[PDB]
């Protein structure tokens, strides 16, 4: 139910504020779920008991009309009243059987146990920014949005990748902050929560897009999957080359003289 | 012409049995994750100020002295009550010059002896003791010793939202402030009722006047000596329960079973006994004792420089000729390879550089932060300190406090200086003690 | 709304006056928007939220009939009452669908979300003068006008460049002085405003025309795009050769003797 | 002619407010009062003062 | 200072500023330190960079350099109460113990509002003189 | 107090830092003579005020 008074005090203190910053950059990444590191979100391929993966929880909230998401138009993204997504258009396009329910407000639309694709979702988009704290002068990361993409079969056997919908981070912060999942394949205690797995920056991936003034995506200037991967390594050298160059801890020049 | 003016200067005394820790910086966390265990890596650098520290853990003699003081206070309270006969000599409200002021209790009249007193005095003295019909032994009643200590909260009274007058809440001129501002605040008070039960409640009321920041608690102080039997099942530990706290030959052995609350109660009590004796008239605001924070502990153990992963010179557990540095179990069921099975006598093993003793092993140590697996990233670098005072209505998950350093029950992996363990705030065990620190006042040039 | 009294005092003090000058020259430049340096004006290829590029703001003002512009007749340019441009002739010539609006004074003509070419405008004309301050004796630059040109498709695939309309600098000074845009591709804080990006002379380009007594444009005496670019380098040597020659700071002649 | 009215006491509550989740409370009370910091720098003065 | 290196001849730091990540204490002092601790510059000024920053009497505008004349530059604007909160920022120059080694460069701009103070800004006073050119 | 003599200095830096996005800027100026405070305003003087 409702949190206590001193509980609400703790939350406002921990929220990150980016009102002023003299260096801020935005980067988009593609997190792959078939590598061991990112397997954490794909632990139950199906609903068993209380264990639920991320996509299973997301579909759970929206059936209760207690959450909001927006459609994905190519190129630009903005979260306004107009782009809100109606359930009926979403359900029909992807092909899932649905029936009117038995309770008016408990469930919007009856969903089957396995009709919901929980094992087919394989890659996640994460939109992050790196910012410079003014009062403390240290670098830090903040997450804004998360979008899940899925794969489907086609006549020519074209492995298609299609996005489903965007998500704001704040709307999801409270639902996921208490469900427990493991953290490794060789240790199975449910120590950590999914909320903490984004905060500590434990996912890996390939940089897909960066905010450039010409507004172009990486692929357009990249010819093949071989050549595309080469670009990411140099970009990661720019961000990491910054953090080393900002501080001057020790150089070989002063000692010798 | 603006030469300048000064103020009277006052010194900073050196408390007894204390040593000094200098300033510096250390790297928190280990960079190479253990392949076997599933714990991932973590790292973050910090810096910390100066502060004194206790050489040895709090022994048994000092806790016994605190218990005797509390018992004497309650006895003198019981002496002057209408039921047992009120003596006007033990409580004074008339000034020596002759005026009326707030009452208190006098500490310059010796307590009557057991049999040399009058009958009613004997019946009054016998009021706190306990008797057992089956075994015929007398012991201090556990539930009749309570201690109420009042502490203020300065840091919560200086936030920009906490000021009283409505003009200073927001400094922007584009956003006005309506006169009717509502800010919700919460305090803690404990009420003793008619029949003699302690009830603790949390009240939330609108911010009107400054009394709201005051806090007052009530906590029983007798140690939880029944921990030995409960923690270990199917083992003959009954030998230590009865003896550990009473026998005079263990006076200088470590304490055991103190929960978090009682630890704060002792830390708060030390201040009154210190101040009532010394006088610091002009411009020497003294800082009270408190439990150490996480960063100060790490900095104290890691010997300052980041290479040392253990609190000694080298990186091997053993010594030059076949001896163990710490009182910890080195072999499967071989608790006795280190020399001692139970917590041992302090000052038995060699010290580290600074001067601290028995830094790892023996008993673990309490800490004043809160537990969260993302704890390292959520605090700023200078003087990190995450503090959360729990409310009674919150679930049982959100009141865990970190314990750091390990103890005689731990394997050789846990005695690494950077390893986290959590224990609830309401339950004590058989392998946790505590130690006290104190913020210092020194000058940078020296 | 209205500015304060001391606000209007600040403006009149900062305005540049060229009433007297013993050396003044006029130069026309062609600023290209596909180079990184001039990308600043082409950040949103389309209207997203509040972010708006320059051309998007220009079309915004004129729909409210709070701004004035003039047609571009080849060769001579003068801003009088006769050459003012009526909206209907302008709208019809370039081919955009339009419909009568719902409010009499709020909007003149309904425009679509993407019918307005905001991604097709690619090059800007800037008309500037270099003048010699009499009271302080230092050189400085002032901007007078700005005209946007666009590109369109044609049957023979002739990449056509057509101007749209001239603009006086003063009329635009107040509308653009508060909208914020970034200043680099590797840092994305909205520190600066478009008003300051013209003042500090941060655009680059190729000199197209200069005020010559025969009144001829550069192209007429230039044969090919190859040969045209060669002329600009020498002109930039004349303006820069002036600033060095006017002051005598240090010569090797006096030291030796 | 101009005339102003400005409070002059220094804004000593700045230490706690600027840094969140840090134990800076030690300096607030002492920085301006203790006699052993008389020759240390001032802090918290706004433009007006 | 004389050279272009932050460190000195034998392993010491000239200014009270943070030289390492979270290593505020490598410079010797964590809080603002005692004046006259570090060596002076040629003229005679002391503790010129680091320790606390310093107020300034101009106004903030990203085009600030071009808008003032060369002799005795001074842009002054006294704000009125009815103006928005954007137009009352004043420049602060020199950096302080919170700043990284990039900000202690003598030519670097920082802005802070006129109504709020913080924990790393101080001030110092100057005075116009009357002297004779021949001497 | 100490004395500062007349002269001229070049304001701004000509080589922009590659990492940060700040562009270059430069302008020369000259300034008159003026006294100055050796040390920042200490605590003793503000207390006297």
Numbering used by the authors:
A (entry chain D), C (entry chain E): 25 to 281
B (entry chain A): 11 to 456
D (entry chain B): 224 to 272
E (entry chain B): 322 to 456
F (entry chain B): 28 to 76
Which passages does the manuscript contain on this structure?
Within the trans-envelope complex, PorK and PorN form a ~3 MDa ring structure approximately 50 nm in diameter beneath the outer membrane (OM), bridging the proton-motive force (pmf)-dependent PorLM molecular motor and the translocon Sov, thus representing a crucial component of the secretion machinery. Our structural analysis reveals that PorK contains a repurposed formylglycine-generating enzyme-like fold, which serves as a structural hub for complex assembly rather than enzymatic activity.
Here, we present the cryo-electron microscopy (EM) structure of the PorKN ring complex from Porphyromonas gingivalis at 3.2 Å resolution. The complex exhibits a 33-fold symmetry with PorK and PorN assembling two tightly packed and wedged subrings. We further fitted the Protein Data Bank (PDB) models into their corresponding adjacent density units, labeled as chains A, B, and C for PorK and chains D, E, and F for PorN, as illustrated in Fig. 2A. In the purified ring complex, PorK occupies the wider portion of the ring structure, while PorN stands vertically between neighboring PorK subunits, forming the ring’s narrower portion. At their interface, an overlapping region of roughly 10 Å in height exists between PorK and PorN. The extended N-terminal helix (residues 25−37), disordered in the PorN-only crystal structure, stabilizes within the PorK-PorN complex by fitting into a groove formed by the VR2 region, InsH domain, and VR4 region of an adjacent PorK subunit.
